[PDB]
């Protein structure tokens, strides 16, 4: 049947549903080419897919909504890679090698009092 895979990164929420067959991809009633296609490098979403021969393989029905392009694209990649692992729990090594199985814990940063941007300390040419 189907295999779910959460996946997320940088305030993102990925939801990819892998079905056996139908290399069609849709993200929130949109094409992976009409929502991401022709962007900065949204070739990451379908990266893990092709990473193991896709298209004429299975299906991808996603529903993401969190973070900007980069992130929203990173989340899906996480959900998908996570998902495939369900259809076959003996391919973890492969996906882990690339570094998809792991999530990008590297989140944003919090500003701080005294500073001007969490790290950028105010200048004092004269000291």
Partner 1 sequence: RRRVIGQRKILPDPKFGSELLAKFVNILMVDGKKSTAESIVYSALETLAQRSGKSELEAFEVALENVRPTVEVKSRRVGGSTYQVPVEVRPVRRNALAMRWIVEAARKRGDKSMALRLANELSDAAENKGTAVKKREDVHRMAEANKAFA
127/119 Cα distance (integer angstroms):
20
Does residue 24 touch RNA according to CB under 7 A?
Answer: no
CA distance 21 to 58: 4
Cα-only R_g, the chain:
18
> Residue 103 in contact with residue 8, Cβ under 8 Å?
yes
CA distance 42 to 18: 19
> Which does residue 43 bind out of partner 1, RNA, none, counting CB within 5 to 8 angstroms by kind?
partner 1
Q: Which of residues 32-71 bind RNA (CB under 7 A)?
A: 35, 38-41, 65-71
Residues engaged in binding partner 1 (CB under 8 A): 40-41, 43
Nearest distance, CB of residue 79 and RNA, angstroms: 8
CB-wise, 21 or 29, nearer to RNA? Answer: 29
Q: Are 8 and 15 in contact (CB under 8 A)?
A: no
Q: Is 112 in the site for RNA (CB under 7 A)?
A: yes
Task: Kindly state whether residue 13 participates in binding RNA, applying the rule CB under 7 A.
Answer: yes
CB 39 to RNA: min, Å:
6
């Amino acid at each position: 049947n189907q295999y779910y895979g959460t996946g997320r990164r940088k305030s993102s929420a990925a939801r990819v549903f892998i079905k056996p067959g139908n290399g069609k991809i849709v993200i929130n009633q949109r094409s992976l080419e009409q929502y991401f296609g022709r962007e900065t490098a949204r070739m990451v979403v379908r990266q893990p897919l092709e990473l193991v021969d896709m298209v004429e393989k299975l299906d991808l029905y996603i529903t993401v909504k969190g973070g900007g392009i980069s992130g929203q694209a990173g989340a899906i990649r996480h959900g998908i890679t996570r998902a495939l692992m369900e259809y076959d729990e003996s391919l973890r090594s492969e996906l882990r090698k690339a570094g998809f199985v792991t999530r990008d814990a590297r989140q944003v940063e919090r500003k701080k009092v005294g500073l001007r941007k969490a790290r950028r300390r105010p200048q004092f040419s004269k000291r």
